[PDB]
Write a protein that binds this ligand. Structure first.
Ligand code: HEM
Length: 291
């Protein structure tokens, strides 16, 4: 498959900035969701899950075709709980009916991170909705009950290397697990709706204890009320992952720069951009705009 980026006809920077503003303002307004964590965490989880179905071998999956909108992908077990992020973005799509689904889903992730005080993520437009028969089959998204060699091998299908995987994983400072969605329960830290290098600091500073949870799954629990998944705990079991974890713990700006590069690569995998295409857009925050 080739997937050529096609700008939505007649739209420019100013148009996409209005869709960003709309998402950012509704993030401000619906602050009560999930005990006052707000929708920002589920929105970056949604942008990583629409993107994480990609396979570099045959160019199937990825963010381009906006296929999460179809039943098969929407009802994938690994996506339980994302229906909340979909329902949030849906009034915004009715307001701007011209934006493609993959562009809206991916832009929700960019808006969430920058409004939660994160790095600026450059974003590119151009995904085109594709038919229901291009919807990836269930089962391409990663398991939590596994080790550092599973993680390295999995992320290789999206050709992410070690540094990219560790940086990407740092988005687990946001939000929390929910027993009814994934069989795991608890947050990764205290400030779970502000983007910081906290996940790395908890991983190197907490006295973690392995316990079974109410779903019979194992997880690492700390005295502080925080949890780590087996796949998360892997990053300090592997000698190569652990030097990067330490590096991000001592330097949030290096983590912000590397997370910025890898989240954009994750959102653009599987998409060919012609060089007549617009440069990546850097969107302003509500705060930068005085709104
Ligand atoms: C091996 C990789 C990964 C695994 C096994 C994994 C697994 C999970 C699980 C089990 C949950 C909890 C879902 C729930 O109960 O609602 C979760 C949540 C979340 N994940 Fe990951 N994760 C992985 C990678 C990533 C990456 C690369 C990102 C983002 C760039 C990410 C972002 C999030 C966010 C922000 C949440 C919280 C959402 C919320 O609060 O509802 N994850 N992850």
């Amino acid at each position: 498959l080739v997937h050529v980026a096609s700008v939505e006809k007649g739209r420019s920077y100013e148009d996409f900035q209005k869709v960003y503003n709309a998402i950012a303002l509704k993030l401000r307004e619906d602050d009560e969701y999930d005990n006052y964590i707000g929708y920002g965490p589920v929105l970056v989880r949604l942008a990583w899950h629409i993107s994480g179905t990609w396979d570099k071998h045959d160019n199937t999956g990825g963010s381009y075709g906006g296929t999460y909108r179809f039943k098969k992908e929407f009802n994938d077990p690994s996506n339980a709980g994302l229906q909340n992020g979909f329902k949030f973005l849906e009034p915004i799509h009715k307001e701007f009916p011209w934006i493609s689904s993959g562009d809206l889903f991916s832009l929700g992730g960019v808006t969430a991170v920058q409004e939660m005080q994160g790095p600026k993520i450059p974003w590119r437009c151009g995904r085109v909705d594709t038919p229901e028969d291009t919807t990836p089959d269930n089962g391409r998204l990663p398991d939590a009950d596994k080790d550092a060699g599973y993680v390295r091998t999995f992320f290789q299908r999206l050709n992410m290397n070690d540094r990219e995987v560790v940086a990407l994983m740092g988005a687990h400072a946001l939000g929390k697990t929910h027993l009814k969605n994934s069989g795991y329960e608890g947050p990764w830290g205290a400030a779970n709706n502000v983007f910081t290098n906290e996940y790395y600091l908890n991983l190197l500073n907490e006295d973690w204890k392995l316990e079974k949870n109410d779903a019979n799954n194992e997880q690492w629990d700390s005295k502080s009320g925080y949890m780590m998944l087996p796949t998360d705990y892997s990053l300090i079991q592997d000698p190569k992952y652990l030097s990067i974890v330490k590096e991000y713990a001592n330097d949030q700006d290096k983590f912000f720069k590397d997370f910025s590069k890898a989240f954009e690569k994750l959102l653009e995998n599987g998409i060919t951009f012609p060089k007549d295409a617009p440069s990546p857009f850097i969107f302003k925050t509500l705060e930068e705009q005085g709104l």
